[PDB]
């Protein structure tokens, strides 16, 4: 993003009466009192969604962030207020991103307030590790990343993007409320910071969707994905054996493969891309014969003859960022904005109970280890390994936020007779 690019300044002219209409980033960064550019492109901002922090200042000044926090600088002086800012950003971001990106609906005070807690300079490395530096300390003249900035007092080489440069009509609230009933406006700065990030997420991940953008590994992404594949195979295989459906309607990703390739059933696929905005309406999508597989295909009310994996947007993890209108932004290799978890979607179904099933040839005691050996008295070591490993994946998947649901007649008692 060129510093000589033009910045629309009408949103600033109430806090800053008389501001030039003709303004570049180079002049604005100078006017703000100051790594080619503090400001970044929409594309760069999308690539670093994990770093977004909504930021609003309202005027003695009230700083509010999309973490829900409101600080008053004068009410306490800036020299302590900037300590809090580094601490809050480091604890929010250290497990999410190598930077911060302040998302703004800029009117003026937020930009003029930056010089009181931001230092910039050449790109630097953490004094105590190899990550890029995000903080500076004036007491030691040293730099640190988000993990090692305890005590540091300045944010260093932050990034930022002004949503009001994207060509909106009207003010923040009226634009946010068009898409979002979850965030109100209590007339506190942090409410504006939250609405600003909500709108930005709506524009970049709900209205728009770029599934080519890859995102770095920051946790159990790979173990979770592998667990999900394992559980899916297990659960669909068992449902076909227990109830012997003649046909399975696999509704969802257009690049899906048979997850139980050796099953005897007629496998029919139906293409439906991950819905980002509102959950699909089962009436438009449509199935009464056999069983329907909705593996991460969020609909408003599943049919009764379904197997269902549905991500729960409320889960607290580093992979799941707060989203728009109650949805959440699940970033695991790719970004998937997900509509809000709604329990009523599952009224025709029941929670799927845990169970491990195997027909593979052959100290654990478990009613849920469905195998020949356990049928005959005592679980062999192999199936005791496989069982304890499957339990681990299952628990990983659940804890990652996924939830499983099945037709009410599903009964693991029916699997014992396949031995
Ligand atoms: C006590 C300090 C000095 C202070 C400054 S502004 C404020 C209240 N904030 C708002 O009215 C507001 C407007 C938009 N979003 N929030 N309190
Ligand atoms: Zn470090
Ligand atoms: Zn919102
Ligand atoms: Zn066995």
- Tell me, yes or no, whether 82 lies in a domain: yes
User: Angle, to 10 degrees, between the axis of helix 221-243 and the axis of helix 381-400?
Assistant: 110
Listed in sequence order, the DSSP H helices in 12-120 are 25-31, 42-47, 78-93, 109-112
Last residue in a domain, options 206, 237, 257:
206
Q: Examine the domain organization and report whether 169 and 268 are in the same domain.
A: no
Regarding the beta carbon of 182 and ligand 1, being less than 6 Å apart is answered no
Q: Examine the domain organization and report whether 162 and 288 are in the same domain.
A: no
Regarding the beta carbon of 306 and ligand 1, being less than 6 Å apart is answered no
**From CA 60, how far away is CA 87, in angstroms rounded?**
22
Q: Examine the domain organization and report whether 150 and 227 are in the same domain.
A: no
Last residue in a domain, options 150, 175, 206:
206
Q: Examine the domain organization and report whether 266 and 157 are in the same domain.
A: no
- Tell me, yes or no, whether 211 lies in a domain: no
Q: Is 387 strand, coil or helix?
A: helix
Burial of residue 10 (number of CB atoms within 10 Å: 0-12, 13-18, 19+): exposed
- Is position 110 annotated as part of the catalytic site? yes
Regarding the beta carbon of 57 and ligand 1, being less than 6 Å apart is answered no
Burial of residue 213 (number of CB atoms within 10 Å: 0-12, 13-18, 19+): middle
Q: Which of 48, 107, 110, 337 is catalytic?
A: 110
- Nearest ligand by distance to the CA of 198: 3
User: Any idea what DSSP says for residue 24?
Assistant: B
Which of 66, 107, 187 for a ligand 1 pocket mutation test, highest count of atoms within 8 Å of Cβ?
Answer: 187
- Is position 98 annotated as part of the catalytic site? no
- Tell me, yes or no, whether 213 lies in a domain: no
- Tell me, yes or no, whether 345 lies in a domain: yes
- Tell me, yes or no, whether 4 lies in a domain: no
- Tell me, yes or no, whether 17 lies in a domain: yes
Last residue in a domain, options 206, 234, 255:
206
**From CA 374, how far away is CA 354, in angstroms rounded?**
16
- Tell me, yes or no, whether 49 lies in a domain: yes
Rg (the chain; Cα; Å): 26
Q: Is 23 strand, coil or helix?
A: coil
Please give the method by which this entry was determined. X-ray
Question: Residue for token digits 């009613």?
Answer: 367
**From CA 328, how far away is CA 312, in angstroms rounded?**
9
Q: Examine the domain organization and report whether 173 and 311 are in the same domain.
A: no
**From CA 214, how far away is CA 353, in angstroms rounded?**
34
- Tell me, yes or no, whether 214 lies in a domain: no
Using the atom order of ligand 1, give the atom closest to the CA of residue 191.
15
Q: Which of 340, 291, 296 is nearest to 314 (CA)?
A: 340
Instruction: Give 182 Cα–ligand 3 centroid separation in angstroms.
Output: 6
Decide if 350 contacts 365 (C-beta within 8 A): no
Residue 47 phi, psi dihedral angles, 5° rounding: -60, -20
Q: Is 10 strand, coil or helix?
A: helix
Decide if 307 contacts 407 (C-beta within 8 A): yes
Query: Dihedral through CA 395, CA 401, CA 402, CA 406, nearest 10?
Result: 90
Q: Is 255 strand, coil or helix?
A: coil
Q: Examine the domain organization and report whether 144 and 273 are in the same domain.
A: no
Domain of residue 184, residue span: 10-206
Regarding the beta carbon of 45 and ligand 1, being less than 6 Å apart is answered no
Task: Please name the residues in contact with 7: beta carbons below 8 A apart, sequence gap of 6 or more.
Answer: 23, 24, 25, 28, 39, 162, 165
Q: Examine the domain organization and report whether 99 and 162 are in the same domain.
A: yes
Residue 110 marked in a binding site: yes
What sign has the CA pseudo-torsion 93, 201, 254, 391? positive
- Is position 153 annotated as part of the catalytic site? no
Q: Examine the domain organization and report whether 102 and 242 are in the same domain.
A: no
DSSP letter for each residue of 189-236: HHHHHHHHHHHHHIIIIIS---TT------SSHHHHHHHHHHHHHHHH
Look at the chain and report how many structural domains it folds into: 2
**From CA 355, how far away is CA 341, in angstroms rounded?**
24
């Amino acid at each position: 993003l060129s510093v000589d690019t033009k910045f629309k300044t009408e949103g600033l002219c109430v806090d800053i009466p008389g501001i030039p209409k003709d303004m570049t980033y180079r002049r604005l960064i100078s006017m703000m009192g100051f790594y080619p550019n503090m400001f970044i492109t929409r594309e760069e901002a999308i690539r670093h969604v994990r770093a977004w922090i909504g930021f609003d200042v309202e005027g003695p000044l009230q700083l509010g962030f999309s973490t829900g926090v409101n600080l008053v600088a004068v009410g306490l002086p800036w020299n302590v207020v900037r300590i809090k800012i580094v601490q809050m950003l480091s604890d929010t971001l250290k497990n999410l991103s190598d930077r911060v990106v302040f998302v703004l609906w800029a009117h003026g005070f937020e930009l003029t307030s930056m010089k009181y807690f931001v230092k910039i300079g050449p790109e630097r490395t953490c004094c105590l590790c190899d990550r890029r530096a995000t903080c500076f300390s004036t007491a030691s003249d040293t730099y640190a990343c988000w993990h090692h900035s305890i005590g540091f007092d300045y944010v260093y080489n932050p990034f930022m993007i002004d949503v009001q440069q994207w060509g909106f009509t009207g003010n923040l609230q009226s634009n946010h409320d068009l898409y979002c009933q979850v965030h109100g406006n209590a007339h506190v700065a942090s409410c504006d910071a939250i609405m600003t990030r909500c709108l930005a997420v709506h524009e970049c991940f709900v209205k728009r969707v770029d599934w080519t953008i890859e995102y770095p590994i920051i946790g159990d992404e790979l173990k979770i994905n592998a667990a999900c594949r394992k559980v899916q195979h297990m659960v669909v295989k068992a449902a076909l054996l227990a109830d012997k459906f003649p046909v399975l309607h696999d509704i969802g990703n257009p690049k899906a493969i048979k997850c139980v390739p050796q099953a005897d059933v007629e496998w029919k696929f139906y293409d439906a891309q991950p819905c980002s905005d509102k959950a699909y309406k089962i009436e438009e999508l449509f199935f009464t014969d056999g069983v329907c597989l909705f593996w991460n295909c969020n609909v408003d009310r599943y049919p009764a003859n379904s197997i269902v994996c549905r991500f729960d947007t409320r889960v607290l993890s580093n992979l799941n960022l707060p989203g728009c209108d109650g949805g959440s932004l699940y970033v695991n290799k790719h970004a998937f904005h997900t509509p809000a978890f709604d329990k009523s979607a599952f009224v025709n179904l029941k929670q799927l109970p845990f169970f491990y099933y195997s027909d593979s040839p052959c100290p654990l005691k478990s009613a849920t280890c469905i195998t020949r050996c356990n049928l005959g008295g005592a679980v062999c070591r192999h199936h005791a390994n496989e069982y304890r490993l499957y339990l681990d994946a299952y628990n990983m998947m659940i804890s990652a936020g996924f939830s499983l649901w099945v037709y009410k007649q599903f009964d693991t008692y029916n699997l014992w007779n396949t031995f």
